[PDB]
Amino acid sequence: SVGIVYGDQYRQLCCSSPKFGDRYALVMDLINAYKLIPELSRVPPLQWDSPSRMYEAVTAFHSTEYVDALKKLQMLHCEEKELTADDELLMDSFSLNYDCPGFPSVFDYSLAAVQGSLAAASALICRHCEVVINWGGGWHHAKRSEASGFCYLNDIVLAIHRLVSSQTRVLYVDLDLHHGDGVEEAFWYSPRVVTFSVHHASPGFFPGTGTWNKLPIFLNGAGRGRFSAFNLPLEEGINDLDWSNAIGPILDSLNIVIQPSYVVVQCGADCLATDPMRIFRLTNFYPSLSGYLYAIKKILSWKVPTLILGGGGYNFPDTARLWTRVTALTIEEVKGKKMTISPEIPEHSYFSRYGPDFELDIDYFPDSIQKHHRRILEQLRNYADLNKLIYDYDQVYQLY
Ligand SMILES: O=C(NO)c1cccc(-c2cn(CSc3ccccc3)nn2)c1
Ligand SMILES: [K+]
Ligand SMILES: [K+]
Ligand SMILES: [Zn+2]
Numbered sequence: 346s347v348g349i350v351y352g353d354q355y356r357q358l359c360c361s362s363p364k365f366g367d368r369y370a371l372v373m374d375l376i377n378a379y380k381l382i383p384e385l386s387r388v389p390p391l392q393w394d395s396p397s398r399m400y401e402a403v404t405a406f407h408s409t410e411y412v413d414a415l416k417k418l419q420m421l422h423c424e425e426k427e428l429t430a431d432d433e434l435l436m437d438s439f440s441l442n443y444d445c446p447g448f449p450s451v452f453d454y455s456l457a458a459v460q461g462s463l464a465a466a467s468a469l470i471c472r473h474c475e476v477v478i479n480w481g482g483g484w485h486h487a488k489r490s491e492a493s494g495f496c497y498l499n500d501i502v503l504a505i506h507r508l509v510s511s512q513t514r515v516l517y518v519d520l521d522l523h524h525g526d527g528v529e530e531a532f533w534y535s536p537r538v539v540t541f542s543v544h545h546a547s548p549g550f551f552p553g554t555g556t557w558n559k560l561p562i563f564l565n566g567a568g569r570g571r572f573s574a575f576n577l578p579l580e581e582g583i584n585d586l587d588w589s590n591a592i593g594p595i596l597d598s599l600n601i602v603i604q605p606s607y608v609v610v611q612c613g614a615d616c617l618a619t620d621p622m623r624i625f626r627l628t629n630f631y632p633s634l635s636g637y638l639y640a641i642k643k644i645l646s647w648k649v650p651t652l653i654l655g656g657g658g659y660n661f662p663d664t665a666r667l668w669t670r671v672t673a674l675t676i677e678e679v680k681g682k683k684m685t686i687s688p689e690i691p692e693h694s695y696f697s698r699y700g701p702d703f704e705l706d707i708d709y710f711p712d713s714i715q716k717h718h719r720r721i722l723e724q725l726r727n728y729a730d731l732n733k734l735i736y737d738y739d740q741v742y743q744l745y
Pocket of ligand 3 (some may be wrong): 532533534535536537538539540566570573574
């Protein structure tokens, strides 16, 4: 069975931020308009019995003083008065500024994604769900004591920590246009959480990591975590087929060698050709085959309990078009039951947002990688030697 995180308060909170507006509502309302919701188990966001218990849960990763600052920032924005000079400095010391400014529900907003992704992890753990989807989650840039790139709390790190604390290994697959730096950093010394981000990287492009660091090299973990952080940076303009061929053997190799207890997928939609980022040229096409659908179906064929999370996506109706299809694909791959998605957007509350033509398909007409494959294959060998893992080196070598 397949779970999905939602709830009336949750929706309202996920829709309160200035950057993402009502995107989460478009997503869930298109999933509902396509009659996918009777197929899905609703997973409610986690709630706590005390302030101390919520605090304990968030400070499994974030610092107490950072959580204090984020909660004070919300309070400060629930009043009319400007911030004082001392409070401006306090917020600045946590990067609670720039692309992560305050607003009246910033703490509740950030916490909501944490509640969602922790209940999604718990559902996988008690085996209630084989796969769980949280399109209100996936905020991979937040750090221990630092907000970054619209991310204030790192719900993914907290979810992954709850999975490993239940020998357990987690594979994290980050499909966002941007390097998943917060999650990579959090598990930099941990062999039990292998992280893999594919992304655009180029000079000046946010956040700047996930690429070359004497000829330059890739850092890939430290201490017992050495070789446990994987990265594949790609050039702008890549299409579905080339991106699919680029990540396919890496994904298959990671599964064979690591044999994960769980997979966590960040499924940011800003690689889409129609995203205002306009960097990659992926689609939501399902006959070109969507790079996203290819990767998700491949991960699901492994039959490992899987958390599927949102992330970037700044063309809100096209993010909804993609994630609706990811959601139908998951139901199909898990229940064994075919889903039939009409190519035309069904009438519903946000139907006008899908003009001028109202189709499910997005409105688009479509050797470095080989060196990267040899580097990654060797890193996987090193990881597997360091961590005393058995594996047929010629079974993995033929995947490429
Ligand atoms: O997705 C991300 N990280 O995973 C990420 C991180 C940092 C910056 C950006 C970003 C997005 N845009 C598009 S403009 C826009 C359009 C709608 C809403 C909000 C912004 N400009 N900068 C994205
Ligand atoms: K990524
Ligand atoms: K790691
Ligand atoms: Zn992104």
